[PDB]
């Protein structure tokens, strides 16, 4: 029935958009459910961001099944326009993937976002 769970609140959404902004600054970001599915195959994916205003929505339902197979966190965001904007990118991106790097300059922000997401998934 809901099909839009979990959907994030306000300050977590802008927090995620800022983390995606520095992630696009550090080329540690994947753009597209095609690419995101490939990163879920290679096991390099930290977590997955999906949009809620994508028409249709059922093209994006494969990512929770593949993530729950791989035990990977995921949270919906309401805008695909702002989700495109946080990529340093001027046309919308429906879904983005966070890649794995322990040498990442922004790693603590990624662990805090995974703390909020993994808090919300339970």
């Amino acid at each position: 029935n809901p099909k839009a769970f979990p959907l994030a609140d306000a300050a977590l959404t802008q927090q995620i958009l800022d983390v995606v902004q520095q992630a696009a600054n550090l080329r540690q970001l994947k753009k597209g459910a095609n690419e995101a599915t490939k990163t879920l195959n290679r096991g390099i994916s930290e977590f997955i961001i999906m949009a809620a205003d994508c028409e249709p929505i059922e093209i994006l339902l494969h990512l929770p099944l593949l993530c729950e197979d791989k035990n990977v966190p995921y949270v919906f965001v309401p805008s695909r326009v702002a989700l495109g904007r946080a990529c340093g990118v001027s046309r919308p991106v429906i879904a983005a993937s966070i890649t794995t790097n322990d040498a990442s300059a922004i790693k603590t922000q990624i662990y805090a976002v995974k703390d909020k997401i993994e808090t919300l998934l339970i």
Binding site: P64, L65, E68, D69, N71, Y111, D115, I122
Partner: protein
Amino acid sequence: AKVVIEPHRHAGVYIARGKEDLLVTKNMAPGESVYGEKRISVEEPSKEDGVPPTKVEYRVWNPFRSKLAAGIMGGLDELFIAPGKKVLYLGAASGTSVSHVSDVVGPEGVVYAVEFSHRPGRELISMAKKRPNIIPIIEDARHPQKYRMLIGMVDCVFADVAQPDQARIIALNSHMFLKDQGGVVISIKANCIDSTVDAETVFAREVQKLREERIKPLEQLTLEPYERDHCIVVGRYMR
């Protein structure tokens, strides 16, 4: 192609030799595929009358995709799951392990699968239509008293559920549905319990509260080649 296959020390798990150390089991489903695994066909047929030629395929078992094959390749002393027993399985994430546990429990043995996330459950209903030994029972794990009629008494319980609070979950299942002197095997993901602290104190209090519920641990181990920051613990009930 050209490999040879021997019976290992554990009953029900078969070793494959030898241009890679490979771990295989017998498939009771002819020519099925669960995740694009590759199958090795080796037979002891007969060209004589009265006996038709056998067709036997074996399935490899990725230790990256399951925790138990990673457990066996890492070295582990005994396995409580053998031909003949009953086994209660927790965690149902993709059903990939459930095929191999269904292989190792034999056609005598019964596999009991538990999940609450309703969308992967239909896959296991389909595999239940494929393999006639995988019995799904779909419910929240936290209330096993809600399906008191729905399962028998079990020799051994395996838990692969990542929670912050799995200790009460195996407490209720262990107090309810387990036989005397059975086996309890628990999987642990490190950061699921806590992440603000070392994993090792989490291991100590994990074995501690595990020991408060009348469970004797035998040996734990760390899986450094295969799945980093992850450990499995093997113990007895009322030993």
